[PDB]
């Protein structure tokens, strides 16, 4: 199996936010499996390999843009299907950044939930 | 390649953003 932390980055501010500022960084690791799967878990996902998605606030119920940075992205080992899903896979043993996508977003004070589906691929 | 579907897990945070 895989062992996965989900960790917030500090001092994210309301307001206007610098492009593709960092909010989380996913770890994952594994003694037994090479790579892994990740994909956002939500009700507005908004692309086809789940790697941007919408997330709501809380108190608000604003949105913003959440995903993969690109050069996460980039690091991608391939694009794979299960049961017709497109999952990217990444190498374990080895940490991503989640950000705040596109151009520069206007994120309203708020607390904003962040869930990730992570699972274990061998190639 | 395959998928191992008993290793998947959901995980999930909350992100603050504070004036």
Known sequence: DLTVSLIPVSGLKAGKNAPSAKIAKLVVNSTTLKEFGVRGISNNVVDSTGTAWRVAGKNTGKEIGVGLSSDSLRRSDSTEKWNGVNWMTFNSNDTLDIVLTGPAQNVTADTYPITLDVVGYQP | ?19
Do not use: H, T
């Open chain 2, 1 to 19: 390649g395959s998928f191992l579907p008993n290793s998947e897990q959901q995980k999930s945070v909350d992100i603050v953003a504070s004036s």
